[PDB]
Design an enzyme around this catalytic site. Sequence first.
Site, PDB file in Angstrom:
ATOM      1  N   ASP A 110       0.760  -1.169  -0.110  1.00  0.00           N
ATOM      2  CA  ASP A 110       0.012  -0.116  -0.034  1.00  0.00           C
ATOM      3  C   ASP A 110       0.777   1.137   0.013  1.00  0.00           C
ATOM      4  O   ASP A 110       0.438   2.280  -0.143  1.00  0.00           O
ATOM      5  CB  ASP A 110      -0.888  -0.023   1.203  1.00  0.00           C
ATOM      6  CG  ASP A 110      -0.305  -0.160   2.421  1.00  0.00           C
ATOM      7  OD1 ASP A 110       0.412   0.666   3.012  1.00  0.00           O
ATOM      8  OD2 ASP A 110      -0.426  -1.446   3.135  1.00  0.00           O
ATOM      9  N   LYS A 162       1.436   3.862  20.113  1.00  0.00           N
ATOM     10  CA  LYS A 162       0.481   4.830  20.193  1.00  0.00           C
ATOM     11  C   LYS A 162       0.985   6.161  20.217  1.00  0.00           C
ATOM     12  O   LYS A 162       2.268   6.696  20.846  1.00  0.00           O
ATOM     13  CB  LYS A 162      -0.374   4.580  21.391  1.00  0.00           C
ATOM     14  CG  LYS A 162      -1.747   4.205  20.785  1.00  0.00           C
ATOM     15  CD  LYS A 162      -2.820   4.666  21.295  1.00  0.00           C
ATOM     16  CE  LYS A 162      -3.128   4.118  22.772  1.00  0.00           C
ATOM     17  NZ  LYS A 162      -3.338   2.720  22.520  1.00  0.00           N
TER      18      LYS A 162
HETATM   19  N1  LIG Z   1      -0.372 -12.568   1.529  1.00  0.00           N
HETATM   20  C1  LIG Z   1      -0.919 -12.503   2.908  1.00  0.00           C
HETATM   21  N2  LIG Z   1      -0.801 -11.163   2.753  1.00  0.00           N
HETATM   22  C2  LIG Z   1      -1.350 -10.508   4.023  1.00  0.00           C
HETATM   23  C3  LIG Z   1      -2.053 -10.838   4.774  1.00  0.00           C
HETATM   24  N3  LIG Z   1      -2.442 -10.032   5.735  1.00  0.00           N
HETATM   25  C4  LIG Z   1      -1.783  -8.704   5.384  1.00  0.00           C
HETATM   26  N4  LIG Z   1      -1.305  -8.968   4.130  1.00  0.00           N
HETATM   27  C5  LIG Z   1      -0.559  -7.857   3.337  1.00  0.00           C
HETATM   28  O1  LIG Z   1       0.002  -7.242   4.331  1.00  0.00           O
HETATM   29  C6  LIG Z   1       0.465  -5.810   3.743  1.00  0.00           C
HETATM   30  C7  LIG Z   1       0.454  -4.865   4.733  1.00  0.00           C
HETATM   31  O2  LIG Z   1      -0.656  -4.934   5.790  1.00  0.00           O
HETATM   32  P1  LIG Z   1      -1.707  -3.677   5.586  1.00  0.00           P
HETATM   33  O3  LIG Z   1      -1.328  -2.360   5.445  1.00  0.00           O
HETATM   34  O4  LIG Z   1      -2.682  -3.713   7.032  1.00  0.00           O
HETATM   35  O5  LIG Z   1      -2.820  -3.779   4.381  1.00  0.00           O
HETATM   36  P2  LIG Z   1      -4.078  -4.790   4.525  1.00  0.00           P
HETATM   37  O6  LIG Z   1      -3.743  -6.353   4.859  1.00  0.00           O
HETATM   38  O7  LIG Z   1      -4.697  -4.684   3.112  1.00  0.00           O
HETATM   39  O8  LIG Z   1      -5.336  -4.300   5.281  1.00  0.00           O
HETATM   40  P3  LIG Z   1      -6.213  -2.802   4.992  1.00  0.00           P
HETATM   41  O9  LIG Z   1      -5.188  -1.959   3.935  1.00  0.00           O
HETATM   42  O10 LIG Z   1      -6.203  -2.043   6.357  1.00  0.00           O
HETATM   43  O11 LIG Z   1      -7.263  -3.270   4.438  1.00  0.00           O
HETATM   44  C8  LIG Z   1      -0.789  -5.757   2.895  1.00  0.00           C
HETATM   45  O12 LIG Z   1      -0.037  -5.629   1.416  1.00  0.00           O
HETATM   46  C9  LIG Z   1      -1.618  -7.124   2.644  1.00  0.00           C
HETATM   47  O13 LIG Z   1      -1.664  -7.561   1.346  1.00  0.00           O
HETATM   48  C10 LIG Z   1      -1.984 -12.536   4.863  1.00  0.00           C
HETATM   49  O14 LIG Z   1      -2.618 -13.062   5.728  1.00  0.00           O
HETATM   50  N5  LIG Z   1      -1.666 -13.402   3.960  1.00  0.00           N
END
Ligand SMILES: Nc1nc2c(ncn2[C@@H]2O[C@H](COP(=O)(O)OP(=O)(O)OP(=O)(O)O)[C@@H](O)[C@H]2O)c(=O)[nH]1
Lengths: 360, 360
Positions: A110, A162
Amino acid sequence: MKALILVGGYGTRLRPLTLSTPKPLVDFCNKPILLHQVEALAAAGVDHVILAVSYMSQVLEKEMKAQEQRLGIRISMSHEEEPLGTAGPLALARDLLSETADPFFVLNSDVICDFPFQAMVQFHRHHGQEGSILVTKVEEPSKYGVVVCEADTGRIHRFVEKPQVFVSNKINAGMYILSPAVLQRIQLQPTSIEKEVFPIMAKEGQLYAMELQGFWMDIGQPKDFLTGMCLFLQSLRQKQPERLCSGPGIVGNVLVDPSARIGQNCSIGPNVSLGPGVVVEDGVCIRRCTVLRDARIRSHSWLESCIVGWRCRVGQWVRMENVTVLGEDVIVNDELYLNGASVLPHKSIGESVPEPRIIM
Amino acid sequence: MKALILVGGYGTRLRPLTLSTPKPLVDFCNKPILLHQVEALAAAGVDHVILAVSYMSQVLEKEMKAQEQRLGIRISMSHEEEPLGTAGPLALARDLLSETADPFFVLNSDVICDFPFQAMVQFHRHHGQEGSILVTKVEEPSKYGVVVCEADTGRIHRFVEKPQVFVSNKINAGMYILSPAVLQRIQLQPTSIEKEVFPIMAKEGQLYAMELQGFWMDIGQPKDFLTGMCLFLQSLRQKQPERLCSGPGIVGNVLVDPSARIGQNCSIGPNVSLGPGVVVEDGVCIRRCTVLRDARIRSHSWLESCIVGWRCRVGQWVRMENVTVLGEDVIVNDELYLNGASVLPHKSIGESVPEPRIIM
Ligand SMILES: Nc1nc2c(ncn2[C@@H]2O[C@H](COP(=O)(O)OP(=O)(O)OP(=O)(O)O)[C@@H](O)[C@H]2O)c(=O)[nH]1
Ligand SMILES: Nc1nc2c(ncn2[C@@H]2O[C@H](COP(=O)(O)OP(=O)(O)OP(=O)(O)O)[C@@H](O)[C@H]2O)c(=O)[nH]1
């Protein structure tokens, strides 16, 4: 030298776009963010990337295996059934990152920024410990976890999750370079890396922090998608100013696909991306919006700060303001007003939405 | 004699459930809604039942070839690339329903009722004209389109879509028996039949109306899903009273799947359908709720009028009321309150939801 990409599944935020295609596959300035990341990663010289997915994403394996043959670097495919979090993905692709004792990139999907890959390698060789973390400046410390850095070394002292205490300006940027001993510390249970694994490494003082220049945005949220949109068009204007389409009815930084069509006598305002194959009719004002592919925006409409999904059809004389996101195949009838309407895919709107609510 | 089933695409109400599985595949009293309709159609003696999908539904293909070898009747799959609506599916499969000059059923999936198939065949043979409609009573005519009925003939003079004049009590019940000459009238454009085609057949006086006795519900909506689940458990009490599970801590008409586990010292209240593999723990009160498969409800919770999705984890001391639909794999934390929370799939809730709002 290898690089792990976290692209597991379901970005919760910006849910009307994530419900149709996965979060790294949504189109950010007429290109998926994963293509941006592996494009800069092959510009860095990384041999093969590895992508860790919990959600079954057959369209993503299709896109990445075409992209693996398109670009020249190999792509290995870390596959998981149960959500393994953010640390667990390093521990499933464990033995492969153990094959060569050489520091590897770890990247979040992201984040879009201007990637200093070799400068980060050069910082990690200059400090010479386990983990290197990328940090940036923000204007609002009351939202993200602050980190404290020493001058001339960039070493961590404390990792604080935090806000509301103001011990530090700087924020996690989502780029890490890690050594294989860090991966030896990571177990196979679904735990998060930034929640515990980075905290004991900060309690050992093992991490060091490298700072960016500017133009950083996590775009996991739709308003953050539009601010990172705005900053990416500013960075394209200042790096490749011939790639933005300029014209008489074009104001500011506007990037338009060659497949996109723009009608006669309309003013397309600043900081917009039009996707491939979109059709803009006459008299349509578009400012700060992102229009994804094959989406038709009909005549005399006004659009500010919005995300129009794939294959939408907004009617005539619709007003659309305050970060409303349309999902895929959303038809909006004529003469309607949308303010904050996060509309789910395959919906037909015939009401105006005066106040921010979710349409399903 | 055959039957067309409108089965296709993304039922927009009941969306927390529609985003995971298709709308005829959601379990209604420990059985999918389509298995209810095809089960009753095979009780009628229909040779083969044709279902017309526009959404790509490979899991529906999968359970329908399993049901094809289960029930002994053939299943034909009409596939649509873009939405043909509800009259277009008659026109796409039109050479198969033109092969035999029989009257055929055409059915909506969201209707659950006591299906009078052979009585409708006898009524259609007695009145001897083109199309026969099933009608039923309602308590508020101001919600659904009304259709007038002559006594002792059942012919339809006039089809009114818009209410609030009170010309008729009777409502369309979603079952039609149609001639081949109806499908010669029908056209390949995505029009819906109850907009235009039934109105010109009612304009020619060609439509006739058959009345249900009772127990009709359209369960396209979640509160209507819970009301139809109440009505189905009432009709199941009066028809198969030894199939509902009875016990000391069980009140009213409760249907429990044999894989479901119910803990000690808990009060399962009236009109509760527990799916296969659910785990109800110690001291949980559940009234008027539908718990779909693999969903765990931890101890000391209170649930009234709710739809718990697949593989949920409702925590301890959680209160849920006011038709709060949980999607697939929703983890509700302990000591929370949900009132009207229509929660999207793969969410984790850590906050109370006091007013009815959508959590994405
Ligand atoms: N492959 C795998 N990828 C994960 C998993 N959980 C999180 N990710 C990845 O972790 C990366 C960073 O986590 P986040 O910034 O919280 O993004 P997110 O999991 O998409 O959650 P949100 O953006 O808040 O909806 C993201 O690119 C997700 O695709 C998982 O369980 N399996
Ligand atoms: N196969 C096909 N099926 C359709 C299509 N459009 C509607 N249907 C079916 O038409 C039947 C009756 O229509 P509706 O009562 O409005 O149900 P719905 O299409 O699910 O819409 P909602 O229930 O309001 O979300 C449903 O069983 C749908 O599956 C289509 O474009 N292709």
